[PDB]
Write an enzyme that holds these catalytic residues in place. Structure first.
Site, mmCIF file in Angstrom:
data_model
loop_
_atom_site.group_PDB
_atom_site.id
_atom_site.type_symbol
_atom_site.label_atom_id
_atom_site.label_comp_id
_atom_site.label_asym_id
_atom_site.label_seq_id
_atom_site.Cartn_x
_atom_site.Cartn_y
_atom_site.Cartn_z
ATOM 1 N N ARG A 233 0.817 -1.204 0.000
ATOM 2 C CA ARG A 233 0.000 0.000 0.000
ATOM 3 C C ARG A 233 0.856 1.261 0.000
ATOM 4 O O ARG A 233 0.701 2.138 -0.852
ATOM 5 C CB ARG A 233 -0.894 -0.013 1.231
ATOM 6 N N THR A 234 1.781 1.347 0.946
ATOM 7 C CA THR A 234 2.615 2.554 1.040
ATOM 8 C C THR A 234 3.556 2.661 -0.149
ATOM 9 O O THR A 234 3.773 3.747 -0.676
ATOM 10 C CB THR A 234 3.436 2.579 2.344
ATOM 11 N N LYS B 277 21.397 -11.548 5.953
ATOM 12 C CA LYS B 277 22.816 -11.746 5.688
ATOM 13 C C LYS B 277 23.709 -11.294 6.840
ATOM 14 O O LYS B 277 24.226 -12.120 7.591
ATOM 15 C CB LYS B 277 23.198 -10.986 4.418
ATOM 16 N N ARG C 134 11.395 2.167 4.258
ATOM 17 C CA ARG C 134 10.573 1.656 5.359
ATOM 18 C C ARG C 134 11.339 0.493 5.969
ATOM 19 O O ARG C 134 11.944 -0.279 5.234
ATOM 20 C CB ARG C 134 9.219 1.161 4.847
ATOM 21 N N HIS D 201 5.958 7.833 10.867
ATOM 22 C CA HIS D 201 5.501 7.556 9.500
ATOM 23 C C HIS D 201 5.025 8.911 8.984
ATOM 24 O O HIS D 201 3.833 9.109 8.796
ATOM 25 C CB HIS D 201 4.342 6.538 9.529
#
Ligand code: CTP
Ligand code: CTP
Ligand code: ZN
Ligand code: ZN
Lengths: 310, 144, 310, 144, 310, 310
Positions: free
Chosen positions: A54-55, A84, A105, A134
């Protein structure tokens, strides 16, 4: 240049009222008059170390609407990192040699701020860091309020749902607290109450807030009804069943709502908003999502372009 | 015993002198250092004391002691003469030495220095992490 | 047209000294004067049958810096192949009807070469095939050496780490061996020594090489210190602990280094290079990564554009 | 700065004094401690010195100093008098303070004290982990 | 009581030659005359933190053949004790209140030894701890050697394959070095040679050993040919292909073998012993596996039953 | 027959104080004098639809200690009965034709109760059903309290940790409330308080309880300190860090503890009891676990053997 040129966008706590107004004015202008070539020849990294379709779609769409190119990845089990052992620091040190801006994000709080320490002169835009910030969700929320209400001061804002763990409501509350005369109504299960630190911040600025056990207590007065998702996990299944009726919205609940009143929701909604609300003139959650495009464009434009040519 | 020149940190609470030496890397020098631990204090019952020759602390360095030895006194010495006494005051900010209690903070896995904004409250000191932006009581951050 | 026009780029073994110089000169020019519309209207397939975020971001960024469009995928558990049963041959036969160039990384050696047999007139660029080749890493390494040192002949190059399994060091050694007067220093655990076939190739051309057990033996003379990753898996945990000190670099080790000396590393580094090296003027691994952009641009430009308009 | 009763660890190499205090938790006590770091020697140039009152060390406790201060002297003092003089000798076991360099060793995750058997070789000291039974040069174990 | 009554069985280095002989003599007795009720009413934990079907079946069969009851687990991917959240210490502290003995296999070296510090009076038998010990494998190997050759002194023993990483070959060498006059032949690719520390131990004891590039150099004088698996990961595929012929056995290789010679392999042997070997009188790897039952019965009997077995 | 012969054991609420005392008295008898053949020739199903290694090992050991045979399964991710395709009803209808008793653990509340409606004359013992009951945990807790304190009446019992979601603390409170004169202390973060419905039950019975913010407020008068795990998910990481010191125990906390006081924890305790507690005379959590064997033997004996145990 404009105040936001080449600035990192990490936290709503770093943005002044003037900054917020500038983003919002720029959004209105780009919405009225698109500039599809503004960022031609720019390459932007879309780095979702934590996945969020969505974002990410919304942000990348914003990038393309300004003519920018996009490279990126979305993680958890596929990307060649985060399994990793390369530091996030090194990842940013590399990526910032490639691109003109980094949108990121990440599952840990502080990740975007750390990125800024390694990105040299490449701006970092936080698309969410753990339970911290956010800011572009907050920007799109604010743009939607300002556009539907014509202002960001002297509002009656109800917030409903999971107010304890909503990164989104904390940020929106801090943001609105940079403006004057706003009054808040908090409607939440006791287990999921708005945190004390938010309440202390409101007290410190003489901003009125009150708790209410049902939407009905405030409906006649509310300008913005901001609904949030209640994650079933954050309650026990029986507990949920007992209190859910007080955070769930249906069309009948809107009978005495003011004409100007809008219902917002950061999405996804599942239970919180009945589909019958969708056809009323109050439902504005899809328009809100649509506004993410203009808020996110404005931010990229302001950060990557010296002078407001608009 | 007396020194010719440098810094003497006096009136350190017991079990803090060694903390100071570790946290602030005081023994990482070639300068002569004399240390006294669990010394009798008529004022404190017991105290710790550190002397570092030919070495001087700035005001902020002295302030970085505030969390651990709030009632310490720092003496600037030259020619066997105390030429300045100062006391730790709460700084605006504390870097390097503290660890963020939030286990999900990016600060842990990464080549960065911890950093905290300092804010005094009625009965404790609030410490807000630069990275995760969460704020904690100092009693929680200091917690072993 | 230029010697590389419409050519496949599969192996460093296929590239002459002149070819290497041409790529490197083109990289310097595009770095000084970008041509963001050179490849406008070209579509390039970015096909990572084996995932590699680092390499893929770098390659795609290069594509966008020339104005090309990009389609592609990155595999292992998500793509609709490599689990199914369609031959790589058929995959290329299809994809080469779509795009103007194919950039591919794959887990089996020879995969890019096979692709060329099915791509018709569509050039294939190898982004790595098993333990065989990775010629664009070698190109970016060479461009970095040439840029920092001003030449590719008469150098003292130390290579440190896992010299047995490093596809990257084998390729770089072959490449440098196309030039004159270079001298090599190999610093590796006995279990991970540079392979004999490489040593035989060096002997055959009268190129000097010597083994050393510590960086200190060669530091005063080294122009390029090329560090590699030692995969913990490729040793037993105790074995690693005993020899790791002789492939690990810290800032103190650089005290008697020449002014011109650069430290390179294909990345990721985890243990091999202490973070304190990062601030010295010798650290050049991030600049090296950044140069991947120009080396990869030059290659796309030379392959897809007849005449050097630069 | 003489003491009436306790232990004096003398002739410690520079930059080892603080290390001894850390590793062996010597400051975790209410007894008076006096420390000199980077003291002039001539006996060896520069030295560290540790004085612990009303506290004595067994022969094995002294032997744990071997890896770090092989040339130290441990003095016993009673009634202001030097009653005992001792030098560390290589012990047969080293517990608690060392860390096993094998990353897959069970010792890392678990509520146990590290333990190594000590084997003097010609050019170095071999340390063998009680748990994983791997043997390492003391140089390798001491590195981290 | 017998010398091993209530003793932990952790490492071959903790077992004397007399202990070894005692286990083997008890194994011969139980083989010749079963005692199906010896351990009636004992409950044994079969704790395979690291999965190992063949070793677990072998051990559990041995428990049942003595009449013991069995409880246990095996971890493919998931259990939240001994690893995940809970310490191994806590797991053992709990399990040692349920059962009369613990047989455990674990991925980390030292795991069984750590168990003994928390098991109270409950004995622990090491079924394998990372790359450290696997004493019951060595016990069953020795039993098989003693049975087929009539002795454990003055033997010619060849070990083939991955001598570097084979925990099984390391302990068999230590064990055989507790006896007199044994001579060793080590056939292994240079990348996988018997470690120096094993060589040093043999030298100190004045035990003869030599290195050989292939099986045929020694085929005519060996009494025991002990083969091991070379797992493909330990080498690169082309490297594997290049050397593999040195450590693979086929029936024609046995033409000049002594009549008494037996081929052993701890299994699985898929990649190094051809099936045409199976029918020769020298093939003894399945008989070897069958002897695991008797060696593991002997150990359980000795540790849990006060009186010597008759 | 004894009062529990052939009875289902589903919920603590279905068991009287006399039943509880009967189980405990039988547990003391079997502890003092084992009966390894009592359940000879019984076959018991150990059905762990939800995996739980510690509970399963405990239960299965108890079955073997009475001489019963055991068949069963444990579901990490996959079995197509009792969940996936087949109804739990059908699974039980089938299994109750194979075995003499069913011990089952299941992720959904009511699962064991549902089993009784399809098991015919085969008894069902609840080894845990979602967030509902876990009667054998409570039985072993009570046995341990009775053993160490000499009684189950007139006690001072402190419960610490996640009192809201701990199914184990809820049933122990119900159970202890069947006895006389018990007084409770509830130490828990406000987000994790003992539920009202438990408080209402105590009030109705005139049983004293108080809330405390930390262990030290009550340390001097408790006979039983019952600790529980606070799983990290139930809180946010910063929230956890903020409060955790209230529900963690270390040895120094015990300075003023009564001599008879015992610390219990249903385990795993990794995050709330420091290891320095282990050696104090108050640490009783491993002894508690050991008592699981005796409590679970008692229940199996009582349900499957007509005659009272002597
Ligand atoms: N040449 C000197 C002078 C002073 N000191 C130390 O500096 C500290 C403070 O000196 P001074 O002011 O002279 O003693 P006080 O009057 O006790 O100071 P205060 O009132 O702060 O305790 C003392 O611990 C003293 O030992 C020193 O070590 N060398
Ligand atoms: N009451 C005392 C007596 C002696 N010392 C210290 O104990 C150490 C050894 O004392 P001593 O044998 O008298 O000095 P040396 O003869 O020089 O000993 P060495 O030859 O070992 O240097 C010295 O550091 C001294 O300062 C002390 O602190 N308190
Ligand atoms: Zn933080
Ligand atoms: Zn170890």
């Amino acid at each position: 240049a404009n105040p936001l040129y080449q600035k990192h966008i990490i936290s709503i706590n770093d943005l002044s009222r003037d900054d917020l107004n500038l983003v919002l004015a720029t959004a209105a202008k780009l919405k009225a008059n698109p500039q599809p070539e503004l960022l031609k020849h720019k390459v932007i990294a879309s780095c979702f170390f934590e996945a969020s379709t969505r974002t990410r779609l919304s942000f990348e769409t914003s990038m393309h609407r300004l003519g920018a190119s996009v490279v990126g990845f979305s993680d958890s089990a596929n990307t060649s990192l985060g399994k990793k052992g390369e530091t996030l620091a090194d990842t940013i040190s590399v990526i910032s040699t490639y691109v003109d801006a980094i949108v990121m994000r990440h599952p840990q709080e502080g990740a975007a701020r750390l990125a800024t320490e390694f990105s040299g002169n490449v701006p970092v835009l936080n698309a969410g860091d753990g339970s911290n910030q956010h800011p572009t969700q907050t920007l799109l929320d604010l743009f939607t309020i300002q556009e539907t209400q014509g202002r960001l001061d002297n509002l009656h804002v109800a917030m409903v749902g999971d107010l304890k763990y909503g990164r989104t409501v904390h940020s929106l509350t801090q943001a609105l607290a940079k403006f004057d005369g706003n009054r808040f109504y908090f409607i939440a299960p006791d287990a999921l109450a708005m945190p004390q630190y938010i309440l202390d911040m409101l007290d410190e600025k003489g901003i009125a807030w009150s708790l209410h056990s049902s939407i009905e207590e405030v409906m006649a007065e509310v300008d913005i009804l901001y609904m949030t998702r209640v994650q079933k996990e954050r309650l026990d299944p029986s507990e949920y069943a007992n209190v859910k009726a007080q955070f769930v919205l249906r069309a009948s609940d809107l009978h005495n709502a003011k004409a100007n009143m809008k219902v917002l929701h950061p999405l996804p909604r599942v239970d919180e908003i009945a589909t019958d609300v969708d056809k009323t003139p109050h439902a504005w959650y899809f328009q809100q999502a649509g506004n993410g495009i203009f808020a996110r464009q404005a931010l990229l434009a302001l950060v990557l372009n010296r002078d407001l040519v608009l | 015993e007396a020194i010719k020149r440098g810094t003497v940190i006096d009136h350190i609470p017991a079990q803090i002198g060694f903390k100071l030496l570790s946290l602030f890397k005081l023994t990482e020098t070639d300068q002569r250092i004399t240390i006294g631990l669990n010394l009798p204090s008529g004022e404190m019952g017991r105290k710790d004391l550190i002397k570092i020759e030919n070495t001087f602390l700035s005001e902020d360095q002295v302030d970085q002691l505030a969390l651990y030895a709030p009632q310490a006194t720092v003496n600037r010495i030259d020619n066997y003469e105390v030429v300045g006494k100062s006391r730790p005051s709460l700084p605006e900010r504390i870097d390097n030495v503290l660890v963020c209690p939030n286990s999900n903070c990016i600060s842990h896995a990464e080549p960065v220095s911890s950093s905290f904004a300092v804010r005094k409250r009625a009965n404790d000191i609030a410490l807000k992490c630069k990275y995760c932006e969460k704020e904690f009581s100092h009693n929680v951050v200091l917690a072993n």
